[PDB]
Design a protein around this ligand. Sequence first.
Ligand code: NA
Ligand code: NA
Ligand code: NA
Ligand code: NA
Ligand code: NA
Ligand code: NA
Ligand code: NA
Ligand code: NA
Lengths: 92, 92, 92, 92, 92, 92
Amino acid sequence: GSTFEEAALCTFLLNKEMYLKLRSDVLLPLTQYNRYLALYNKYKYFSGAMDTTSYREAACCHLAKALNDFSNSGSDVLYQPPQTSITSAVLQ
Amino acid sequence: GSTFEEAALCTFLLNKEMYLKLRSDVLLPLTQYNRYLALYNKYKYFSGAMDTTSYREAACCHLAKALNDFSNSGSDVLYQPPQTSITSAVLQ
Amino acid sequence: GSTFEEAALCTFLLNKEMYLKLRSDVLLPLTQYNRYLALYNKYKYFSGAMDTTSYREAACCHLAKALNDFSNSGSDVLYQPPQTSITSAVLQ
Amino acid sequence: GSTFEEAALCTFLLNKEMYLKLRSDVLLPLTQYNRYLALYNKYKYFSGAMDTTSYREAACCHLAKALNDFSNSGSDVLYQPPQTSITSAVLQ
Amino acid sequence: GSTFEEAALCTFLLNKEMYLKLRSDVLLPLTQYNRYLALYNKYKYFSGAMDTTSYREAACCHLAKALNDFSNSGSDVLYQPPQTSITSAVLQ
Amino acid sequence: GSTFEEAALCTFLLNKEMYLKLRSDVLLPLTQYNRYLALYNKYKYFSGAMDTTSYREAACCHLAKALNDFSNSGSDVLYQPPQTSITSAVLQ
Ligand code: NA
Ligand code: NA
Ligand code: NA
Ligand code: NA
Ligand code: NA
Ligand code: NA
Ligand code: NA
Ligand code: NA
């Protein structure tokens, strides 16, 4: 929801406390979290074959991917939203 | 539209070329641009009396305000999105 | 003192060690720390009704507020100084 | 050379003066500049099918691409190095 | 004054308009601007031989130096405050 | 190696896990890590008397210094690469 979407655009320390709040915020709707993990791969390595390059949607996937890596690590990491681009915004 | 909303979240050089592309993107719908200028003052000086503090909505107002200041200046300025806050995202 | 004032302008990981060093640096003078907490709310939600908007003073309040939130949390957070603004520096 | 490689890692205002200094620095060796433009597309959209993801090499391509866009625009833009990633540095 | 001191801590586009406002703000007191240029050299290359390493004072010198380079160039540049350091703040 | 060199250019949370991966990456070659610690002092305080100011080499020293401070502290810190400078890249 809002919490996750707005958090995906921030730079923050991803730790147990933060992982809990953001991961919970995307438990519902159900398929929500898995869709963002499916799109991370496209948005990161196969951006060329994408007829939708929403920056917010990209950020949500970058955060989802980060929560996932943390769920298999427990090691705190600095989360950073994906690089913005004014030339990318003017081109759709 | 998307261009403006996505641009409001970037850090870029606001010059004539950029002012034209972003200002045009918010000519329609009509009241769009004026609403963002009305909300800028609330989001900046009267945040306390607001039962809606969407970060994206805040960014759109910060950019609208920037385009306005540029329309009465012609002097290029570095645009920067408003400060993010993970504690603000977890608090509604 | 200097340590706190200079720290309020940095981006750092606020943890127990750092909380101890900065909170100690503002134990004296006595009313120092409480004044910065009183001003945080003005600088954040009631900026309009303020005939003094010193950026350094704003940063000191943002840090004081951060130390306070940490004293009731123990959870490490990334501290970030408040958004700067060249248009704010030229306007008094 | 050094100037371009080191500049590709900085955040600066790309204008005529800067375009001249950096573009000149990559006139020699000859194929240098064209190779960086060929690699930009891979790094940006086809990163998945790439058995070499040097961050410095990525930055050089991002800057080359920026000089190119400027050569067909004359409009000053803020240049920003590509997003860094500690998780990308530990994975080769 | 305040304008210059507060500006020295911001990231902004240094152009004719901005150069005029900030350079004027340090015309008085008289020796003000020249002292900051004398200290830039120490703060940048001879930091070791300094019994005073105030970050704000360092920023003021970095900005003074920037205004000077601009006075002999007319070419707009992105100004950036000097790197902050929490380990530098805790050590005086 | 690549891991350390590329990491020295990133902004990340330096913790036990990260300290282990980066410190290991510079165990070999042998004198590697000690040379970067010797150069840190020059780059930070005696930059003036230095006929080699490679930014990457500077970053490697800033990271080496950070790993060292962490080896005698165990307290997680946010690592930040040294301030970049386009005016420094055009001057060798
Ligand atoms: Na939800
Ligand atoms: Na529109
Ligand atoms: Na004190
Ligand atoms: Na060359
Ligand atoms: Na890599
Ligand atoms: Na003055
Ligand atoms: Na090695
Ligand atoms: Na250099």
